[PDB]
Amino acid sequence: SARQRLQAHAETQALRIQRYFMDAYQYGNGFARLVQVLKDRGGSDLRAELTRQARASLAGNPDVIGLYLVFQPNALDQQDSHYLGQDAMGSNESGRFSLYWSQPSPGTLELEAMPETMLGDTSIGSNGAAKNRWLTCPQDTARTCMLEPYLDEVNGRQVLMTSIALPLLEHGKVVGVVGLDIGLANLQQLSVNGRRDLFDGQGQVSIATAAGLLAGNSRDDSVLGKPMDKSVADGLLRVAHPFTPIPDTAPWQVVLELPES
Structure with a gap:
């Protein structure tokens, strides 16, 4: 449905952060x-x-x-x-x-x-x-x-x-x-640059590490380096796509959040 379409965007962002x-x-x-x-x-x-x-x-x-x-x-x-x-x-x-x-x-x-x-x-x-x-x-x-x-x-x-x-x-x-x-300031700019590209900025973009820590989060700056919110607010659907920063390591992931409309 529309969630496969937001997942397709998360895979796009994941390959972009992996290229970085x-x-x-x-x-x-x-x-x-x-x-x-x-x-x-x-x-x-x-x-x-x-x-x-x-x-x-x-x-x-x-x-x-x-x-x-x-x-x-x-x-x-x-x-x-x-x-x-x-x-x-x-x-x-x-x-x-x-x-x-x-x-x-x-x-x-x-x-x-x-x-x-x-x-x-x-x-x-x-x-x-x-x-x-x-x-x-x-x-x-x-x-x-x-x-x-x-x-x-x-x-x-x-x-x-x-x-x-x-x-x-x-x-x-x-x-x-x-x-x-x-x-992580560079990684925070990647999440902000990803937010802008995401359907013109109505959602949020987060980068999660292999241990669940936030290496980037376009919404709040003061949460970098801490565990990502396991829970999720409503009105926004949270999709994730993994990526591998270096060969043969536990994958990080790009987290997308976006209103349904």
């Missing part, structure tokens, strides 16, 4: 391939080159608010002791290559060497997952991870975000992690 995530995923693998080939060929000045390439990679994608590249201790070049505290080369206090580039707005990139305390913070954050799951998930599973929306701390700023974490593997061994941070 998959393009970021493919873009991250491109940088990961560059990292691996830079590591596999060695040479001098590698850490400074990786830091420069990481910035140019993040600068080349205004849809991404953060890019982290964390290697295991001495996994990058077996010379962590040669780079103690040189944050300008992506190395933290222990010489480990733990680099994070931030892009709070397109074209504004901030450099940061993440300390070992941040890489080991096993305390539980807002979403019920550990604060360092953005790094430990791909390390412990040797596979890519689509992380649930969490509120991160970036230079004194609380940023609500999800992450695409790619593991860098050598013979099945995770030597490092590449990650792309996608702010």
